[PDB]
Amino acid sequence: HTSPLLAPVRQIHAFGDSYSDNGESQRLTREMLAKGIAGAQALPGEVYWQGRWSNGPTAVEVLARQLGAQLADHAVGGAKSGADNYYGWMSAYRHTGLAGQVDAYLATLDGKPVDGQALHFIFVSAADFFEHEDFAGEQPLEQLAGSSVANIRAAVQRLGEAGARRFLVVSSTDLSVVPAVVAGNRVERAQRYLQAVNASLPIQLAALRKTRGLELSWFDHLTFSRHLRRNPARYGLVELDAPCQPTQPSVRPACANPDQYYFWDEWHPTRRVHQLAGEAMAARYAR
Numbered sequence: 342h343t344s345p346l347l348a349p350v351r352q353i354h355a356f357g358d359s360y361s362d363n364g365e366s367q368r369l370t371r372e373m374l375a376k377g378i379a380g381a382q383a384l385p386g387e388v389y390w391q392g393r394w395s396n397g398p399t400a401v402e403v404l405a406r407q408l409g410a411q412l413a414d415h416a417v418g419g420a421k422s423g424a425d426n427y428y429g430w431m432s433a434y435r436h437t438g439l440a441g442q443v444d445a446y447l448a449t450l451d452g453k454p455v456d457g458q459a460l461h462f463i464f465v466s467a468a469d470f471f472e473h474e475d476f477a478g479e480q481p482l483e484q485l486a487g488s489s490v491a492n493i494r495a496a497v498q499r500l501g502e503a504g505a506r507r508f509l510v511v512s513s514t515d516l517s518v519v520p521a522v523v524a525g526n527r528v529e530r531a532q533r534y535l536q537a538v539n540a541s542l543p544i545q546l547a548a549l550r551k552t553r554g555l556e557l558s559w560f561d562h563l564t565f566s567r568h569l570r571r572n573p574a575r576y577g578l579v580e581l582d583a584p585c586q587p588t589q590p591s592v593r594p595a596c597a598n599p600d601q602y603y604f605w606d607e608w609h610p611t612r613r614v615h616q617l618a619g620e621a622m623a624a625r626y627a628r
């Protein structure tokens with residue numbers, strides 16, 4: 342039996358990575374390029390919609406629309422769970438990881454309290470895995486997952502310390518079906534990492550929720566994607582594996598029917614999947 346819906350939401354503060362970013366990586370990389378920061382690149386790039394790492398709004402943007410909430414989206418594409426980014430060259434200008442987004446949010450309150458009614462939305466950890474795989478991190482995956490979990494728990498604790506009371510934390514996504522992971526022959530590594538994060542993180546968050554009297558909702562993105570991918574026609578999806586917009590090894594013309602595709606590029610879902618995800622996340626809350 343379902344439990345009572347949570348109270349309505351009028352303001353979201355979002356923290357996370359390319360699965361949430363609604364323009365920050367674009368703004369920050371333009372700033373870095375202007376300053377001549379060594380190794381800077383324009384992100385996300387030309388085959389993306391209005392600075393989102395997709396062809397349309399991210400899940401948290403759709404969540405805000407569904408709930409009748411204003412969104413302050415602090416998320417930065419590439420953000421790790423700790424202080425820094427997949428893009429190592431950003432650290433010279435800004436710490437854009439979850440920990441750095443939390444520091445910047447708390448430092449910019451301008452003598453105002455944290456809004457105890459605002460939903461603090463956290464969606465991070467994929468970049469920890471992509472960085473470890475792409476640049477040969479030596480940490481065993483079980484230790485990398487434990488660091489991801491610790492970093493997310495520390496973020497919730499630090500936001501709660503400052504006055505936050507309401508959270509929605511998203512699980513790891515199914516990294517094991519990401520086209521770049523499939524192409525890297527890294528399906529089993531992704532499965533082991535995401536299972537370690539998803540078993541441990543909700544245990545840690547439940548303990549913290551009780552200790553600090555928080556309203557903290559857990560969104561299991563893996564259950565969500567397994568249901569979509571097992572029953573795609575129900576959702577109007579046709580292609581679950583091929584990116585609509587190939588970028589590796591080079592950019593090729595986009596598919597004609599992007600709303601029938603799961604993946605936009607080799608790492609990121611389409612606007613259609615972000616829409617279903619944001620509707621699914623909204624299901625725990627009253628409008």
Ligand SMILES: CC(=O)SCC[N+](C)(C)C
Pocket residue numbers: 358359360394417418419420427467468471472608
């Ligand atoms: C989940 C993210 O923030 S990743 C963006 C894509 N990347 C792994 C190639 C940096």
